[model samples]
Structures are given as structure tokens and as C-alpha cells.
Target: SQQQIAALSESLQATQQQLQALQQQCYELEKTNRLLVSEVMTLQKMVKAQNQASNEIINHL
Candidate 1:
């Protein structure tokens, strides 16, 4: 099996074989952005849980 080995557009010069790796680059970026969003949601939930628990402790004291 043979595969093209350069990222080219309309007779562009040679570069480091990222032409075929485009899919992984795209997937990594997508995952990076989505992971940040999920991380924020996790932090928000943990912050709220801490505040609610603290409020109960203070009321008893």
C-alpha cells in the first residue's frame, strides 16, 4: 500500500508528513476543547457541594 507523504495544496512544497495526520490533529483539538468544558462543569459542582456542606456545619455551630 502506498500513501501520499506531504501536506500540499495546489503544488505546495514538501513538509513533515502532516497531510495524513490531519484527522488526529482535528480530533485532538476537538477533544481538548470538549475536555475543558467538562472540567469546568466538574469544578462548579464541587464548589457548590463544598458551600452547601459548610453552610450546614455553620448552622449547627
Candidate 2:
């Protein structure tokens, strides 16, 4: 029973390490997602501004 317990303890430690690594990866992906969202928002605003400018130029002509 003692040997079995020791083996189980080692397995638990390895599992914990693996979980920590996966958690870190998840965090990095979340940060990347936030950056992409900000970039998309900026691009959308630029497109709108350009459309308004083109309309003004067309009306003036």
C-alpha cells in the first residue's frame, strides 16, 4: 500500500505540472485575442472615416 501511494503521488505531481502549462497557454491565447479585437476595431473606424471623406469629395465635385 505504501509503494502504491508513492507512485500515485508522483503521478499527481506530473498531472499538476501539465495542468499549469495548459493554463499558461490559455492565458497567452486570451491576450492575443484581445489584441486582435482592438486591431479590428481600429480598422473599422478607419474604413468609416474614409467613406465619409470620399462622400464629401464626391458631393463637392
Candidate 2 lDDT score relative to the true structure:
1.00
TM-score of every candidate: 0.57, 0.85
lDDT scores in order: 0.78, 1.00
Residue 54 lDDT, candidate 2, scale 0-100: 100
Residues 18-58, candidate 1: write the lDDT tens digits: 66478679999999999999999999999999999999999
Model 1: weakest 10-residue lDDT segment is 1-10
Assess candidate 1 and give its lDDT: 0.78
Q: RMSD per prediction, one decimal?
A: 7.3, 1.2
Looking at candidate 2, what is the lDDT of residue 16?
A: 100
lDDT of 2 by residue, 1-61 (tens): 9999999999999999999999999999999999999999999999999999999999999
Question: Candidate 1, 20: how far from true, in Å?
Answer: 6.9
Q: Give every collision pair in model 1.
A: none
